[PDB]
Enzyme design. Structure first.
Site, PDB file in Angstrom:
ATOM      1  N   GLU A 153       0.837  -1.190   0.000  1.00 48.85           N
ATOM      2  CA  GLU A 153       0.000   0.000   0.000  1.00 48.85           C
ATOM      3  C   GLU A 153       0.874   1.243   0.000  1.00 48.85           C
ATOM      4  O   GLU A 153       2.083   1.184   0.235  1.00 48.85           O
ATOM      5  CB  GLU A 153      -0.944   0.046   1.200  1.00 48.85           C
ATOM      6  CG  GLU A 153      -0.476  -0.730   2.397  1.00 48.85           C
ATOM      7  CD  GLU A 153      -1.516  -0.758   3.488  1.00 48.85           C
ATOM      8  OE1 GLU A 153      -2.713  -0.580   3.181  1.00 48.85           O
ATOM      9  OE2 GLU A 153      -1.138  -0.944   4.658  1.00 48.85           O
ATOM     10  N   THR A 154       0.240   2.380  -0.262  1.00 45.89           N
ATOM     11  CA  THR A 154       0.917   3.665  -0.280  1.00 45.89           C
ATOM     12  C   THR A 154       0.972   4.255   1.122  1.00 45.89           C
ATOM     13  O   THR A 154       0.073   4.039   1.938  1.00 45.89           O
ATOM     14  CB  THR A 154       0.205   4.634  -1.222  1.00 45.89           C
ATOM     15  OG1 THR A 154      -0.028   3.995  -2.483  1.00 45.89           O
ATOM     16  CG2 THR A 154       1.039   5.884  -1.439  1.00 45.89           C
ATOM     17  N   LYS A 155       2.038   5.000   1.392  1.00 48.85           N
ATOM     18  CA  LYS A 155       2.224   5.669   2.670  1.00 48.85           C
ATOM     19  C   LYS A 155       1.726   7.104   2.563  1.00 48.85           C
ATOM     20  O   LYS A 155       2.105   7.831   1.640  1.00 48.85           O
ATOM     21  CB  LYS A 155       3.697   5.646   3.072  1.00 48.85           C
ATOM     22  CG  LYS A 155       3.941   5.497   4.558  1.00 48.85           C
ATOM     23  CD  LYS A 155       5.424   5.550   4.875  1.00 48.85           C
ATOM     24  CE  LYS A 155       5.670   5.939   6.317  1.00 48.85           C
ATOM     25  NZ  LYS A 155       5.726   7.414   6.491  1.00 48.85           N
ATOM     26  N   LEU A 156       0.880   7.504   3.505  1.00 47.04           N
ATOM     27  CA  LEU A 156       0.228   8.803   3.473  1.00 47.04           C
ATOM     28  C   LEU A 156       0.941   9.779   4.399  1.00 47.04           C
ATOM     29  O   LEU A 156       1.438   9.394   5.460  1.00 47.04           O
ATOM     30  CB  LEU A 156      -1.242   8.672   3.873  1.00 47.04           C
ATOM     31  CG  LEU A 156      -2.068   7.716   3.012  1.00 47.04           C
ATOM     32  CD1 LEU A 156      -3.123   7.018   3.850  1.00 47.04           C
ATOM     33  CD2 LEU A 156      -2.709   8.447   1.852  1.00 47.04           C
TER      34      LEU A 156
ATOM     35  N   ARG B 284      -1.661  10.653  12.486  1.00 47.88           N
ATOM     36  CA  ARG B 284      -2.221   9.355  12.833  1.00 47.88           C
ATOM     37  C   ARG B 284      -3.332   9.557  13.847  1.00 47.88           C
ATOM     38  O   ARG B 284      -3.137  10.242  14.857  1.00 47.88           O
ATOM     39  CB  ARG B 284      -1.161   8.423  13.410  1.00 47.88           C
ATOM     40  CG  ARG B 284      -1.720   7.082  13.854  1.00 47.88           C
ATOM     41  CD  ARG B 284      -0.812   5.939  13.462  1.00 47.88           C
ATOM     42  NE  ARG B 284      -1.474   4.645  13.568  1.00 47.88           N
ATOM     43  CZ  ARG B 284      -0.872   3.482  13.369  1.00 47.88           C
ATOM     44  NH1 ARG B 284       0.411   3.410  13.062  1.00 47.88           N
ATOM     45  NH2 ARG B 284      -1.576   2.360  13.479  1.00 47.88           N
TER      46      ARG B 284
HETATM   47  O1  LIG Z   1       8.209   6.740   9.519  1.00 52.92           O
HETATM   48  P1  LIG Z   1       7.128   6.374  10.504  1.00 52.92           P
HETATM   49  O2  LIG Z   1       7.557   5.412  11.580  1.00 52.92           O
HETATM   50  O3  LIG Z   1       6.322   7.541  11.005  1.00 52.92           O
HETATM   51  O4  LIG Z   1       6.086   5.543   9.635  1.00 52.92           O
HETATM   52  C1  LIG Z   1       4.910   5.010  10.222  1.00 52.92           C
HETATM   53  C2  LIG Z   1       3.761   5.978  10.116  1.00 52.92           C
HETATM   54  O5  LIG Z   1       3.303   6.051   8.751  1.00 52.92           O
HETATM   55  C3  LIG Z   1       1.962   6.476   8.731  1.00 52.92           C
HETATM   56  N1  LIG Z   1       1.218   5.664   7.751  1.00 52.92           N
HETATM   57  C4  LIG Z   1       0.809   6.125   6.560  1.00 52.92           C
HETATM   58  N2  LIG Z   1       0.151   5.164   5.869  1.00 52.92           N
HETATM   59  C5  LIG Z   1       0.133   4.063   6.630  1.00 52.92           C
HETATM   60  C6  LIG Z   1      -0.399   2.696   6.494  1.00 52.92           C
HETATM   61  N3  LIG Z   1      -1.059   2.317   5.378  1.00 52.92           N
HETATM   62  N4  LIG Z   1      -0.204   1.845   7.518  1.00 52.92           N
HETATM   63  C7  LIG Z   1       0.449   2.213   8.633  1.00 52.92           C
HETATM   64  N5  LIG Z   1       0.958   3.441   8.816  1.00 52.92           N
HETATM   65  C8  LIG Z   1       0.834   4.395   7.870  1.00 52.92           C
HETATM   66  C9  LIG Z   1       1.405   6.361  10.154  1.00 52.92           C
HETATM   67  O6  LIG Z   1       1.243   7.672  10.676  1.00 52.92           O
HETATM   68  C10 LIG Z   1       2.512   5.605  10.889  1.00 52.92           C
HETATM   69  O7  LIG Z   1       2.611   5.925  12.264  1.00 52.92           O
HETATM   70 MG   LIG Z   2       3.484  10.392   8.497  1.00 42.22          MG
END
Ligand SMILES: *OP(=O)(O)OC[C@H]1O[C@@H](n2cnc3c(N)ncnc32)[C@H](O)[C@@H]1O
Ligand SMILES: [Mg+2]
Length: 71
Positions: A63-66, A70
DNA sequence: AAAACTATGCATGCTCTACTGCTTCTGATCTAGTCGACC
């Protein structure tokens, strides 16, 4: 003995300190409850070469990361 | 014709009420910085 586990589910020191007052008396089962914040599940860095080994040689989801907050 | 009493005008001081200028207090505005929380 079981206080970090309770805090990972309630995120409230008051409940941890009140419910777990007697060391002998424990909590039968601890799980996410309504209107109680739970520490979110996080993600670890991946080295693309061993990705399959990290998924136990099975299908996985991509999936894509947004870029946002959170909640 | 001379003397005594009284009227009116004017000088004098003191007291009270407007107007200008200096000093201080408040309000309003702008600019710079701090903190919460996320990522
Ligand atoms: O770099 P990091 O540890 O903050 O990355 C984790 C965070 O990434 C965000 N995120 C965005 N999209 C997702 C999905 N699909 N699943 C899980 N996390 C995701 C979150 O904010 C997470 O804390
Ligand atoms: Mg983020």
């Amino acid at each position: 003995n079981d206080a970090a586990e309770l805090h990972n589910v309630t995120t409230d020191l008051e409940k941890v300190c009140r419910q777990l007052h007697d060391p002998s008396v424990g909590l039968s089962d601890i799980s996410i409850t309504l209107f109680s914040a739970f520490k979110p599940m996080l993600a670890a860095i991946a080295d693309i070469e061993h990705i399959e080994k990290d998924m136990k040689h099975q299908s996985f989801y991509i999936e894509t990361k947004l870029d946002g907050e959170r909640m």
